[PDB]
Write a protein that binds this ligand. Structure first.
Ligand SMILES: OC[C@H]1O[C@H](O[C@H]2[C@@H](O)[C@@H](CO)O[C@@H](O[C@H]3[C@H](O)[C@@H](O)[C@H](O)O[C@@H]3CO)[C@@H]2O)[C@H](O)[C@@H](O)[C@H]1O
Ligand SMILES: [Ca+2]
Length: 121
């Protein structure tokens, strides 16, 4: 089980110690406040009013928490996942990422605190 911080201005994202293996069931809970530029801050679901200007994850709002499992595309996490199972052939290290447009991460601020564990399976 892993606990750590995911900085909004961390473009490469935060690698975790969780390796998702076939058949794993995982639960994630994310909390906190971040911004992708403005003086306002948003939670892990991001800013529901803001258009997509080339986000790393087109399936979540700008300012939301997303992840990659190994070589995968981005997958929405938002506030978290309850006893979640990945698609077939998705496996590897979980990297947690703040959803912004590539190259726009420098004006970001705040972070989300995140817990990940593996469930019974
Ligand atoms: O989308 C990710 C980026 O969001 C922020 O950039 C925004 C900022 O530059 C504002 C300035 O007010 O403009 C935003 O785009 C506007 C556009 O200027 C308008 O013509 C249009 O009507 O609306 C859009 C959306 O509000 C722009 O999105 C951050 O500053 C960047 O770092 C990125 O994270
Ligand atoms: Ca930004």
């Amino acid at each position: 089980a892993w606990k750590g911080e995911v900085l909004a201005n961390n473009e490469a994202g935060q690698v975790t110690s969780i390796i998702y293996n076939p058949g794993d069931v995982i639960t994630i809970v994310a909390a906190g406040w971040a911004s992708y530029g403005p003086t306002q801050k948003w939670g892990p679901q991001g800013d529901r009013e803001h258009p997509d200007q080339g986000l790393i994850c087109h399936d979540a709002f700008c300012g939301a928490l997303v992840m990659k499992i190994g070589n995968s595309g981005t997958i929405p996490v938002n506030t978290g996942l309850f006893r979640w199972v990945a698609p077939n052939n998705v496996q590897g290290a979980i990297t947690l990422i703040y959803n912004d447009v590539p190259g726009t991460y420098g004006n970001n601020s705040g972070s989300f605190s995140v817990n990940i564990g593996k469930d019974q399976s």
